[PDB]
JSON list of C-alpha atoms and ligand atoms in Angstrom, two decimals:
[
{"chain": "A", "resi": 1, "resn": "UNK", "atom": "CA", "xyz": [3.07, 15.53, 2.57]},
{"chain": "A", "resi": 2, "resn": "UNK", "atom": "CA", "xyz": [5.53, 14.08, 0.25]},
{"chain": "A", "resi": 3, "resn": "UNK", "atom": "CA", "xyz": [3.51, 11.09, -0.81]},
{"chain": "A", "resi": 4, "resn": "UNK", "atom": "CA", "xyz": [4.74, 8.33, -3.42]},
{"chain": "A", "resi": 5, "resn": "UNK", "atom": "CA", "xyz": [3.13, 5.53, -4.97]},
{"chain": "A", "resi": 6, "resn": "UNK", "atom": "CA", "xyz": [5.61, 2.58, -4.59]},
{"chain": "A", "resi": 7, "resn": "UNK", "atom": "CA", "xyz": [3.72, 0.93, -7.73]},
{"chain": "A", "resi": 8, "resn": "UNK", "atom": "CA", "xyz": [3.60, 3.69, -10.08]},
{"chain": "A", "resi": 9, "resn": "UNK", "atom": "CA", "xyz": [5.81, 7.08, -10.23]},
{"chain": "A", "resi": 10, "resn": "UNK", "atom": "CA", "xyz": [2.68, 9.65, -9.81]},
{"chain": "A", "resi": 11, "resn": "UNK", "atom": "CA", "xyz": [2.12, 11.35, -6.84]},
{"chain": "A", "resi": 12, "resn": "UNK", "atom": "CA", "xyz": [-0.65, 12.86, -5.08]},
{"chain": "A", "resi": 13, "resn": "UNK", "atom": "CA", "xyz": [-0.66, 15.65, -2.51]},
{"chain": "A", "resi": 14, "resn": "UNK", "atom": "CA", "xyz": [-3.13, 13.81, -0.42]},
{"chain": "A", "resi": 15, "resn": "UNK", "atom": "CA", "xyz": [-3.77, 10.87, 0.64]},
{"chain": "A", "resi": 16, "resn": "UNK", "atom": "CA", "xyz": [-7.15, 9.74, 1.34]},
{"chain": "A", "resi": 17, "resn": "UNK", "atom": "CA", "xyz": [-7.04, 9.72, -2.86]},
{"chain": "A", "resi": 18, "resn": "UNK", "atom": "CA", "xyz": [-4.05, 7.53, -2.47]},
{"chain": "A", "resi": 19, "resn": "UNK", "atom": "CA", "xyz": [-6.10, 4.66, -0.72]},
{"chain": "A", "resi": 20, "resn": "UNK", "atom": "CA", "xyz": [-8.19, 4.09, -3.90]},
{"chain": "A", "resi": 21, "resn": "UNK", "atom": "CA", "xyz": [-5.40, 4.31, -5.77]},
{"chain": "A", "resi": 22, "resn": "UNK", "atom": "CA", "xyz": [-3.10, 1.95, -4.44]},
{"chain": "A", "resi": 23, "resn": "UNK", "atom": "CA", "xyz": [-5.74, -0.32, -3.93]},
{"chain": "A", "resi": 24, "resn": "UNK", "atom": "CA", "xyz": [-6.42, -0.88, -7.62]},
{"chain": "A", "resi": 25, "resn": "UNK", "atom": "CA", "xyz": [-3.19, -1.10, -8.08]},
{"chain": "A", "resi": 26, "resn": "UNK", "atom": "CA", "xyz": [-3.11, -4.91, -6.28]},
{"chain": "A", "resi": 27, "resn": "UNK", "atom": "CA", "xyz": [-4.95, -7.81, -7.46]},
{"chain": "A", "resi": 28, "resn": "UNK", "atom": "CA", "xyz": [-6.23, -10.52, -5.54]},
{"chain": "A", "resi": 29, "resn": "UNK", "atom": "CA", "xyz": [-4.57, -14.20, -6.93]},
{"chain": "B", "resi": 1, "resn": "ZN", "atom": "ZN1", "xyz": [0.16, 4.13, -8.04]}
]
């Protein structure tokens, strides 16, 4: 699937990886 990170401009084929990813990618204030 065409996947895109809305945070960052890598992309990843799959997306089970993507949950990890984009979860680092927040921060809890
Ligand atoms: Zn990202």
């Amino acid at each position: 699937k065409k996947f895109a990170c809305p945070e960052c401009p890598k992309r990843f084929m799959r997306s089970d990886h993507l949950s990890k990813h984009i979860k680092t990618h927040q921060n809890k204030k």
